[PDB]
Design a protein around this ligand. Sequence first.
Ligand code: CA
Ligand code: NA
Length: 270
Amino acid sequence: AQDWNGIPVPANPGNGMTWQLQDNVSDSFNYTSSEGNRPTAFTSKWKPSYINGWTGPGSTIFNAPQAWTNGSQLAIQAQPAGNGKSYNGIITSKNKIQYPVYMEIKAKIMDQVLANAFWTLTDDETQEIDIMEGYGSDRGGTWFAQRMHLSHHTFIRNPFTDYQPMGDATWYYNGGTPWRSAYHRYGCYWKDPFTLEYYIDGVKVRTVTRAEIDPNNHLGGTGLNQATNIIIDCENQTDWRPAATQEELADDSKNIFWVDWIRVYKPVAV
Ligand SMILES: [Ca+2]
Ligand code: NA
């Protein structure tokens, strides 16, 4: 039994193909775990830290105790750190994925000004896909509470230059309903280095084609081709957002990004 059994994959696997689950990056999180008490069902697939020693952007402090599971769901939690900062949960995959691949979570974002995201990043930190990035609280602006960011980045490193698409379709609106108010399925078909498709609740909402992938050639013509790491996290992005208050961070009814499951598939021959 897995939590998603019976729910179709919304993308087409191709002529004479079928979708096959990638076991080592899929999980129903149907076990109890925490710092000092992590079973093989978790540790064989996930680590409660970033892909390297960085502690995160702005007023973020990535911290292992803030990722845990409750018998049915993954909790990505925030806590007060004092002096204007937070402690922040994060998990990353121990195994990589690569196109062609369909990847999807079922999740409910926090009622906080903090970012909550499901994304990929390569070891060299040059290629990033943002399957979803949400900001749940009305205190950050109702405009943001009511929209889901769907994006990707290409970077030059050392020295640093960032590219992401900036079109209005990168922020998806659901009739005014805040994203904090329910669980949704957030999915992406990374079909090839120049093609991304985004799906919410099984419905295709956005396609990214070649001209929007890397128009400045930060990647030297490869597109989004490299094998990469999966990340699920929360962040206090004070480089551009208002800081979370310490009281908001202490409120255990508002400070958890809940993930019921993650599933990943690849197309294979029948
Ligand atoms: Ca579950
Ligand atoms: Na507002």
